[PDB]
With several copies, the nearest count.
Chain A
Amino acid sequence: PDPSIDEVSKSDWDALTTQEQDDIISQVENLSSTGWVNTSRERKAEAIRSAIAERDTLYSGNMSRLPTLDGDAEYFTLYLSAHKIQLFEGGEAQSESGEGGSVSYSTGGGGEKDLQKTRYGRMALEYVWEDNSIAALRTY
C-alpha cells in the first residue's frame, strides 16, 4: 500500500481514500487462507481502525529506553487487525465438521488474555515483549 499501516493513526485512517483503505484491507486479507470473504468490508475496516487506535494507546511508549513495540509495527498492526477480524466472527475454530468431513486444529486452552486466544494474537504477542513488565526507572 501507498501509506503503510504503521504510518497512520486513527485520525489519519478516517482521512484515507477508498483505494488507500482497500489496499490496506487487501494486505490484511492475505493473513488468512479463506480471506474472511463472508464478512463485510465495514467490519474489516472497523477492526483495522480499532487495531491502529489500540496500537497507539496500549502498545506505544517505553520500558527502559526501549520501545514497548520492539518488532516491525507493520506486521504487528496487520496481526492485531487479523486477530480482531477473527474475534468479530467468533473464537478460534478448534473443531470444524460438515457432511461427515471433520477437522480439529490443536489449539489448546492457551491461557486467559485476548492475544493468547487466537493464532494472530499469539503472533502479535512476540512483538510487544509478550506483555511483560520489564520497565525500569530511578531517582535522579
Chain B
Amino acid sequence: ATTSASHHVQAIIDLLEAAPDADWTPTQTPTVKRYWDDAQSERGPGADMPAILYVWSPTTSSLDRFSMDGDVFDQNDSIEVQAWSFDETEVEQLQGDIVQILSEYLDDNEVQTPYSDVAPTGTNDFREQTPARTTGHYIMSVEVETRGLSETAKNA
C-alpha cells in the first residue's frame, strides 16, 4: 500500500515522506534524501531551510534459505537514516520522530510496506563530533532493519 518500493532504501524514503506534517516535532517537515543526492561540500541544510534526512543501506543485506523448497529467501536488510541540522535540539527531536515514525509498520504482513518487519534497531548520537568554535551541522542517526520473504525464480 504505502510504498510498493522495489528496494529497501526507497521503501524507507517513502515511509518517511508518507508521515503527516502533524507527526514531526519541529514546525517544518524535514526533507528526505538519498545519501548520494547531495555532494559533500553542500551536504546538510542551509540556514532558514528545513532539516535534512539522508537514507542509505550501510551494510550487506542477507539472503538466507528459508526452507528446503527454495521457493523463497529470508531476506534481511539494513538502513541508516542520518538527520542533519544546525540545531542540537532539532536533531534530537528528529531522531525521536524517525524512531516513532518507523515504529509504525513494526509487524506488517506486507500490508503497508512490502515487508514483515521494519524496525529501528539502534540510534547514534554524533553531536560531540561538531566543533563548537564554528557554526556547523550536528548529526544524529537511526539504524533500521527490515525483514521479509523474497521470491525466487526456481519454481517459476
Q: Which residues of B contact A89 (CB under 8 A)?
A: 41-42, 133-135
Chain B CB within 8 A of A111 CB: no
Judge whether A97 and B45 touch: CB under 8 Å.
no
Q: Is the interface of A mostly helix, strand, loop or mixed?
A: loop
Judge whether B133 and A93 touch: CB under 8 Å.
yes
Residue-wise interface mask of B (101-116) relative to A, using a CB-CB cutoff of 8 A (1 in contact, 0 not):
0000000000000000
Chain A CB within 8 A of B86 CB: yes
Q: Which residues of A contact B133 (CB under 8 A)?
A: 33-34, 89-90, 93, 96, 103
Residue-wise interface mask of A (48-60) relative to B, using a CB-CB cutoff of 8 A (1 in contact, 0 not):
0000000000000
Count of chain A to chain B residue pairs whose CB atoms are closer than 8 Å in the complex: 118
CB within 8 Å of A: which B31-47 residues? 35-36, 38-47
- Residues of A within 8 Å of B, CB-based: how many? 24
In the assembled complex, the Cα of A40 lies from the Cα of B15 at a distance in Å of 26
In the assembled complex, the Cα of A96 lies from the Cα of B135 at a distance in Å of 12
Q: If A38-B42, A89-B41, A93-B39 touch, does A33 touch B47 (CB 8 Å cutoff)? A: yes
A22 to chain B, nearest CB (A): 14
Q: Which residues of B contact A97 (CB under 8 A)?
A: 40
Judge whether A100 and B82 touch: CB under 8 Å.
yes
Q: If A36-B42, A90-B41 touch, does A100 touch B129 (CB 8 Å cutoff)? A: yes
Q: If A34-B133, A93-B134 touch, does A100 touch B39 (CB 8 Å cutoff)? A: no
A31 to chain B, nearest CB (A): 11
Q: Contact partner of A36 among B126, B130, B135, CB < 8 A?
A: B135
CB within 8 Å of B: which A90-117 residues? 90, 93, 96-103, 105
Chain B CB within 8 A of A37 CB: yes
Judge whether B41 and A39 touch: CB under 8 Å.
no
Q: If A37-B42, A38-B86, A40-B46 touch, does A98 touch B134 (CB 8 Å cutoff)? A: no
